[PDB]
Design a protein around this nucleic acid. Structure first.
Ligand SMILES: [Zn+2]
Lengths: 71, 50, 52, 86, 100, 119
RNA sequence: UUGGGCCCGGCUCUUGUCUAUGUUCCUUGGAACAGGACGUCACAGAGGGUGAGAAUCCCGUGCGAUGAGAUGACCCGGGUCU
RNA sequence: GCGAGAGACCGAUAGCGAACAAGUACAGUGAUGGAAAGAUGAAAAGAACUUUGAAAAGAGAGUGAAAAAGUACGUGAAAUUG
RNA sequence: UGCUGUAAAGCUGGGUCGAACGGCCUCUAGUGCAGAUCUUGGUGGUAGUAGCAAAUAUUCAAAUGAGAACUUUGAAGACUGAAGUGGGGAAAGGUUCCAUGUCAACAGCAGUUGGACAUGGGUUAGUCGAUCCUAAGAGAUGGGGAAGCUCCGUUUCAACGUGC
RNA sequence: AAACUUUCAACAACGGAUCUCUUGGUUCUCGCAUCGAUGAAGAACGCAGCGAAAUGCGAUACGUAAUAUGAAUUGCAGAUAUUCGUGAAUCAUCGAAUCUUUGAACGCACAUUGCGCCCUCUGGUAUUCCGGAGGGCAUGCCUGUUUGAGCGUCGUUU
């Protein structure tokens, strides 16, 4: 997941199973004030939903990851 | 198969999570009687029936 | 004793010709109870003779 | 070839999971559960299968609401809140 | 099936009789609870008596003519002779029988 | 053990919702740190704090609706008594005590007397 | 001969709190709750726990006492207002 | 069903099928079928340490009243075996 | 270790063991086993025996390791021979996928290897499918049967638009 | 004579009988009347600092409030936790709540996490399109309200 934060400007989040890409795009905007280029989602073999959120070029995903605090 | 329903895939997720060994700190509890997980399941041996 | 003790089985005799005693036996498969004798006062898990 | 060779041709499920009882007794083509009788309003149950009633009856689940009717009855079906002592 | 000089019996036990066997294990318990019910009923209405006054009547049939026993209620004529209305009589511990 | 429910009951709608938001970012921050600690028992305290603030918000809003409907003929069914289905179908005391004028005249005319014997 | 409404009681139900007398001496034992000696209480020598068979070590038991909540056109006794 | 008190009842192949994560594991397409399985010790005090061994283990040692109680645990019969 | 009794049996010495148990007068019964192709559990002889023989076929060296017929790498010898022992999929399975560690059990020899065991990781869609359509058919409604569970019927003896 | 076979004893095996226990069962008695459209019984999926099950619970998820009580919990860890106290633990009690997806199961459908429509608010240059939040839309029957239909029918006017 961290290779995507660096290379592809993509933030990887665990997301609620009931939420769609419209709600995920709004949520990252409201929580972290960041614009998503797209949201690619995925339901994992353990039953949880994973979201690949690529940010627009205006945002550097590595800076956002440090701000959240997991890198 | 690769083409599966959501309801099928949700049952297969629970079956994976129930197929773990016993956490070892549980054997240290007072009046503990469980020595191992007695409900293990191997894919080739016992089928899920889903 | 319970009125139905030893009689909560669908056991049926295999009949003769299978080299076993003609006592009723549990059907089905996949458990170790399957094929075991039932209903008899001589049988483990059967009902007692003349239940009280 | 009615034994081992014919047993190799089993890949078409006659039953799938039932929405009411979750048991894999829902006949696909009949659209009926052989266990609970879904989608009929009543639950399938027979007096010639007393052991089957044991397997699925009141007390075999959570009784998340009947748990507390006795305790609510014993208090006369109170309305209001408990009063703090002075 | 029929052997020796014995009386011929009529033992009516060819149905599923064992499903309808009532054994009165609760005879003493019912006696005690019946006594407690009787005390509660008496203490509720004391000093008013628990029993209504019953008449005395001849037992029917040529076999019980000689005996006399307690009836169910006093007739309307009998209460009329003592100047008590049946509606009033029922409220002062007297039993009424419109049928006799 | 987190926030005190009696302190929460003295707050307005705006203050309770503001504290709920602060608690949720704290829980979100803890879940990020849980990736590395990984054992972080404080998560339990914040989770029960969110439950308390949500409880107080819900309870406070429910006496407001109760006060609005107080004395009204029709109120929401979740604010009605929840005895049992059968006890709700039962006759009220007024309906159960209804009596015909013929039956009321006879009850009054012939009450059960109080008396004794042997005097 | 006689209507109705409340207020305190009683009854009924549930529930809280409270209560006698050895852990004295010797022996065995890892442990005394065993044996022996001297006792104590008992309206309590039911039962359970505690390192072995414990009334007296602990919880209880027995005896009652005293609070809280309920409930009742269709239980009664008083008040009190119509 | 809920709440109690009992017994010349059974005592783990008995008593409910189930004294245990039992209507569980498991079987069957399905209706359904359906087990086995309680006991170290008062207390893990569940054997530190040394040594041989790749390791499992063994031998010393240690704890314990007892290791003729080491979890493959009270007692430990017979068949069968060295 | 013996004693007593015709006997069923009773008592006793030694060893083992660890929490209850017996004699006598009576009461009571789910009260006595060699058999029932008895029941459940356990154990033998057979017996280190039958056997582990289809699908052409393996060998040398090095590495690893306590240990190599079987693991890895290299060299060779072979085979499937494109209607494959190749490369994908549908059904079915469900994590078997991948990496790391790992050998008690399992892989009817072995095992350092594994679809085993343990810990983690992994499945990204406006365009590929589902989703939509109707097929044989299934089946509500209005009705009509049926004591009823329900049966018939599919626009049907209907005032049928959640119309545009 | 060994070996081997058989018998016996001691010790060690195999196995789990016997003995002794017992938070279980069985039977009898006593007392009580309380499921659900205010959504039951049941099902599925989740929830713990570290849990697979059982137990509990429902995105407020091994629980929230309240009342009572009064120092724990415990296998380890840890307070932005607590101790002459609004205070540890507590399904002790329990009257306030929360209660996912369902299920008689109710917008339609369901081998699909498929497809609508209405109201209010809100984002995207929008009465119409796309997104989000909240609230709604089943059937039979009863009482009532409103709007209607029929030369079924009464009165009146050409
Ligand atoms: Zn079903």
């Amino acid at each position: 997941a961290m290779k995507k934060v660096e290379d592809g400007n993509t933030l990887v989040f665990q997301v609620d199973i009931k939420s769609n890409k419209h709600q995920i795009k709004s949520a990252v905007k409201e929580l972290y004030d960041v614009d998503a280029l797209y949201v690619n989602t995925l339901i994992r073999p353990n039953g949880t939903k994973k979201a690949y959120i690529r940010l627009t070029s205006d945002y550097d995903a590595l800076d956002i990851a440090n701000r959240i605090g997991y890198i | 198969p690769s083409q599966k329903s959501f309801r099928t895939k949700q049952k297969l997720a629970k079956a994976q999570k129930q197929n773990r060994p016993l956490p070892q700190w549980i054997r240290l509890r007072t009046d503990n009687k469980i020595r191992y997980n007695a409900k293990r399941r191997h894919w080739r041996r016992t089928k899920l029936g889903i | 004793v319970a009125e139905n003790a030893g009689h909560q089985t669908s056991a049926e005799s295999w009949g003769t010709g299978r080299a076993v005693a003609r006592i009723p036996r549990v059907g089905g498969g996949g458990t170790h109870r399957s094929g075991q004798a039932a209903f008899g006062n001589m049988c483990r898990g059967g009902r007692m003779f003349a239940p009280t | 070839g009615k034994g081992t060779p014919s047993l190799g041709k089993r890949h078409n499920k006659s039953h799938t999971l039932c929405n009411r009882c979750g048991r894999r007794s829902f006949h696909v083509q009949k659209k009926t559960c052989s266990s609970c009788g879904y989608p009929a309003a009543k639950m399938r149950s027979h007096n010639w299968a007393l052991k089957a009633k044991r397997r699925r009856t009141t007390g075999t689940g959570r009784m998340a609401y009947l748990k507390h009717v006795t305790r609510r009855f014993k208090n006369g079906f109170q309305t209001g809140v408990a009063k703090a002592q002075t | 099936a029929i052997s020796k000089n014995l009386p011929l019996l009529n033992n009516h036990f060819r149905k599923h009789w064992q499903e309808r066997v009532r054994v009165h294990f609760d005879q003493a318990g019912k006696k005690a609870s019946r006594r407690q019910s009787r005390l509660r009923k008496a203490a509720k209405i004391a000093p008013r008596p628990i029993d209504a006054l019953r008449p005395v009547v001849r037992a029917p049939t040529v076999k019980y003519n000689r005996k006399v026993r307690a009836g169910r209620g006093f007739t309307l004529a009998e209460l009329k002779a003592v100047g008590i209305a049946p509606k009033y009589a029922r409220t002062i511990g007297i039993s009424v029988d419109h049928r006799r | 053990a987190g926030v005190k429910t009696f302190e929460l009951r003295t707050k307005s709608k705006e203050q309770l919702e503001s504290q709920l938001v602060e608690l949720k970012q704290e829980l979100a921050t803890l879940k990020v740190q849980k990736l590395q600690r990984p054992s972080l028992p404080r998560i339990h305290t914040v989770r029960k704090n969110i439950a308390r603030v949500l409880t107080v918000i819900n309870l406070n809003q429910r006496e407001n609706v109760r006060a609005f409907y107080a004395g009204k003929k029709y109120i929401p069914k979740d604010l009605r008594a929840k005895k049992t289905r059968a006890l709700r179908r039962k006759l009220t005391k007024f309906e159960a005590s209804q009596e015909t004028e013929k039956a009321r005249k006879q009850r009054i005319a012939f009450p059960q007397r109080k008396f004794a014997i042997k005097a």
